[PDB]
Structure formats: C-alpha cells, structure tokens
C-alpha cells in the first residue's frame, strides 16, 4: 500500500500461464492495498512500429526523418501520439513496473519491444546526459517476470542456451538501468508448458509468495559481473 | 554470383545511414551477379504482432490460444498468413540473409523483432531435433549489420554500455545460431550521426569492400566464449 504498480503484460491468451502470473500479481498487490494498472498490450492492439505517425506536429527535419530526434522534440513540445503519452503517464506515476511476458527469441515479444521503443523516448526516460544511474526514471523499480520454453538446465553456463542472466543483459542493463530504474531480481518461470500441473501451481504460488514481500527487496547490482561472472 | 541474398531492412528513412548501407549492399551484391531481394519492413508496414490472425482458417485449439503450437500446426498445414509465407519463401531460397538495422535498446527495432517472431516459426526454422547446429536453416549464412548511437569506446568491457558482443548474444546465438544459420561476423557501424562525413563515407566503404569478398568468409564460432570471452 502507499505504492503504485504498472504491469506491462504481453500475452495473447487470458487463460495462459502468463495470464495466471499477471492475475496473481494483480490479486496480491491489490490485496496489499497497492494501486495497480495493467497495460494488456495485445488487448490494446498496441502499435509496435516506430514511425512518423508517432509525431503529430511540425517535424524538426521533414527532409530526413530521424525517429530519435523527432520523438525527443515531440516529447518536449507535447506532440507525441496519445498512445505513447498514455503509457508515459502510467510509468511516471508508478513506483514499480513489472513486465510479464513469454521469452521470444531470448528477448521480449515484438509488441512489448515496441512499447520499450516508443514509450521510453529521450526527454522522458533518459537524456544525453542523464542515463544509467542518472536516468530519468530514477527512484523507480522494475522487474522482469519471464516464462520460457526451455528448461532451467538448458539455461545454465554449461547448457545449450547459456545462463539465463546472459539474455537479460539488453533488457536489464541496456534498457531498464539505462533509464534509471533500480532492477529487482528477475522472476523466471521455466518451461511451464512441459511442467506438471503441480509444478505449474507451484510456480504461480512462488510468484504470489514473492510479491508478499516485494517492497522489502533490494535491487540487483545491474553490472557485467552480475550478468556474466568473472 | 550463383548465390541468393535476402536483405531484411528496418529503417524508416531512405536517406539515412542505414539506407545507404542497404543501398550499397544491393549495389555491390547485384554487381557481383548475385540474386538480391530486400524486405523493406517499414515500407511493407510489416505486422510485428504475434496474433491469431497469423493462422488462416480454423484454429487447432480455439479455446486456449497458444501461438507457438498454432503456428507450428499452420506451417505443417500450409495455413499461415501470406505475409509470413512470403517471407519464408525468401528465406528458404536465400544463401545469405543480411539484417540491416539501427540498434534500439541493445536489440533490433520492434518491426524487425516481429519479423523474427513471426517468420522463424517451428517447422520452418527449427524443430525438436533441429536447432543450434542442426537448425533447419543450416547451410545458410546470416549477418547482422548494425548501426549504433553509442561510440565504440562506450561499447568496451569497461565502457558504460559493455562489450558490443554482450548484446549480440540473443540475436546471434539465441536466434540465428538456434535456427541453424552459420553466423558471419557482425558489421558494426558505430555512431554514424556523430561521425564526420569522411568517417561515414569511410564506414560505407568498409561495408562495400567487405561485401566484395563476403563469400570467402568463414562463420564465427557462435559460442558463449566468443561473446563473453575471458
Ligand atoms: C516466437 C516465439 C519465440 C520463442 N522464443 C523462445 C526463446 O527464445 N527461449 C525459450 O526458452 N522459449 C521461447 N519460446 C517459448 C515460450 O517462451 C513459451 O512458449 C512461453 O514462455 C510459455 O508460456 P505461456 O504462458 O505461453 O504457456 P502456456 O501454454 O499457458 O502453458 C502453461 C500451461 O499451464 C496451464 N496453466 C495456466 N495457468 C495455470 C495455473 N494458474 N496453474 C496451473 N496451470 C496453469 C496452461 O493451461 C498451460 O497448459 C518462444 C515462443 C514463441 C511463440
Ligand atoms: C528507440 C531507439 C532506441 C535506441 N537504442 C539504442 C541503443 O540501445 N544503443 C545505441 O547505441 N543506440 C541506440 N539508439 C540510437 C540508434 O542506434 C542510432 O540513432 C542509429 O543507429 C543511427 O543510424 P541512422 O541510420 O538512423 O543514422 P543517421 O541519422 O542517418 O546518421 C548518419 C548521418 O549520415 C548521413 N548519411 C546517410 N548516408 C550517408 C552516406 N552514404 N555517406 C555519408 N553520410 C551519410 C545521414 O543523413 C545522417 O546525417 C536508439 C534509437 C532509438 C530511436
Ligand atoms: C532459443 O530457444 C528457443 C527459440 C525459439 C523457440 N520457439 C519455440 I515454440 C521454443 C520452445 C521449444 N523448445 C522447448 C525446449 O520447448 C523456442 C526456444
Ligand atoms: C543503451 O543506449 C541507448 C539506449 C537508448 C537510446 N535512445 C537513443 I535516441 C540513444 C542515442 C543516445 N546517444 C548515445 C551516444 O548513446 C540511445 C542509447
Ligand atoms: Cl525445439
Ligand atoms: Cl579475399
Ligand atoms: Zn545495469
Ligand atoms: Zn551460437
């Protein structure tokens, strides 16, 4: 309670394991008295493409379109498309942002990659300078709650996929820490589709139980050593 | 020559540095006598979202939508949407696939992430016995030609962004190698917007020159060691 949470959710099916993890987060955080908002990207038909339709005012350089330059200016002038503005309001108000999604090619599904590309624009999430520890979303927490097709054993240093932390780098360091977020430890629910029903219920319960004490957690040291070792 | 190349290109502006790199690749490979095709994703308004519209006709299980299962079955039953199958035909016929794009959040822009998510489906790009070395696109070459906002020095082990090889992992190993591609060394054009015109013409020239002998190259060893060294 006394906290606002935004859950950015990326799954097409309400009945899925991801849907259950999203619902258990809403239920638990709601029970605690926290304020909770969910951006259900597929239900919103959220636009993932970074295009000139994202700026509604006069372009800074109409001869040669530069998405980053134009969205930075549009943010400052308040001429960004309203879908982007609506998400920035949710992020601005949130104390914790949880991303709930199935891993697609060792990363986030494209609809959620689009949310990162379009919502986290210069001027809003970072500035030059004003990134990493000085990012604009400093003071906020972020957490990746990911599900995988591959097993935990495949995601180890000696497994075929390498350690799970390796693929977290672009997201935790390159994106969240770059924008100033303090990153909480990822929640990784391995291979639910081939797990037993008891194991799945167990993974949902472990997430619910973790959320009970989420506000007492410290963030991870978002560094190369944490992700890669040595 | 006697080779087919597909360039999957993700930039909004034809006059951009990315546009120039795409154009010299088409020019050089066409001069060599190679068969060249370009999927200009923004011009195609390529759909990035993984949804049930990707399957035509009746769904395998219309009570609980599972994208991976539905697209695997649709691939086997020849019922995938035409935008996806049009791209799969280009890939199937290609000997080399070059991805040309600006780095967005240490990864590919969402429209290109969408192409990977939707085009590289089970049955087409990978299957139970076929992945990594036995991936279904084995025999084909793939190459990432990336442009960055950050300077090369920022992309060093002690630079703020970390070694560039760190962010290449989900793309080169988790995606390309996983599908069976032999991965050629990435072409990284660091910070073209900050560079002088000479340094830029210099980077465009290095790319054109490299393409002259591209078929003489051996692929990189796509391992955790190559990426995280040490
Ligand atoms: C394009 C694409 C790319 C991919 N790339 C990767 C990759 O790089 N790496 C990788 O490892 N995987 C990858 N995958 C696999 C993907 O990560 C998994 O398919 C996904 O994580 C599974 O989560 P889900 O919610 O879709 O599962 P579900 O299909 O929902 O499976 C979970 C099962 O649990 C049941 N269930 C739901 N709620 C509950 C509950 N509360 N209690 C008990 N049971 C419940 C469901 O009915 C279901 O049978 C990819 C998939 C696609 C489509
Ligand atoms: C959403 C988003 C996320 C981003 N995330 C990251 C990130 O994680 N890491 C990072 O490092 N960067 C990031 N960036 C920055 C991005 O990677 C760079 O802006 C992009 O790579 C620059 O390439 P460009 O083609 O857009 O450049 P341009 O704007 O085209 O700059 C090159 C200059 O050269 C000119 N030019 C074009 N062709 C030629 C030619 N043949 N010869 C000479 N000059 C020529 C152009 O007109 C231009 O002035 C991000 C940007 C956005 C919008
Ligand atoms: C890098 O790893 C990837 C990449 C793409 C993938 N698309 C699907 I569907 C899966 C899950 C199938 N594997 C298992 C073990 O269940 C998958 C895994
Ligand atoms: C991790 O690094 C990122 C992340 C997101 C970014 N969005 C933009 I626009 C940039 C270019 C900013 N300039 C430099 C030199 O980096 C950018 C860089
Ligand atoms: Cl598999
Ligand atoms: Cl040679
Ligand atoms: Zn970090
Ligand atoms: Zn590899």
Curated annotation (Swiss-Prot), chains A, B:
Activity modulation: Inhibited by melatonin, resveratrol and 5-hydroxytryptamine.
SUPFAM superfamilies membership: Flavoproteins
Enzyme superclass (EC): oxidoreductase
Modified positions (Phosphoserine) in chain numbering: 79, 196
Biological process terms in GO annotation: quinone catabolic process
Keywords, in A-Z order: Cytoplasm, FAD, Flavoprotein, Metal-binding, Oxidoreductase, Phosphoprotein, Zinc
Matching InterPro entries: Flavodoxin_fold (IPR003680), Flavoprotein-like_sf (IPR029039), NAD(P)H_dehydrogenase_qn (IPR051545)
Reactions catalysed: 1-(beta-D-ribofuranosyl)-1,4-dihydronicotinamide + a quinone + H(+) = beta-nicotinamide D-riboside + a quinol
GO molecular function, one term: zinc ion binding
Residues binding FAD, per UniProt: 11, 17-20, 103-106, 147-150, 155, 193, 200
Cofactor comment text: Binds 1 zinc ion per subunit.
Location(s), subcellular: Cytoplasm
GO cellular component, one term: extracellular exosome
Cofactor(s) the protein requires to work: Zn(2+); FAD
Organism superkingdom: Eukaryota
Residues that, per the record, bind substrate: 126-128
Binding site for Zn(2+): 173, 177, 222
Enzyme Commission (EC) number: 1.10.5.1
Protein family membership: Belongs to the NAD(P)H dehydrogenase (quinone) family.
Additional remark text: Uses dihydronicotinamide riboside (NRH) rather than NAD(P)H as an electron donor.
Described function: The enzyme apparently serves as a quinone reductase in connection with conjugation reactions of hydroquinones involved in detoxification pathways as well as in biosynthetic processes such as the vitamin K-dependent gamma-carboxylation of glutamate residues in prothrombin synthesis.
PANTHER family named in the record: NAD P H OXIDOREDUCTASE-RELATED (PTHR10204), RIBOSYLDIHYDRONICOTINAMIDE DEHYDROGENASE [QUINONE] (PTHR10204:SF33)
Assembly notes: Homodimer.
Protein name: Ribosyldihydronicotinamide dehydrogenase [quinone]
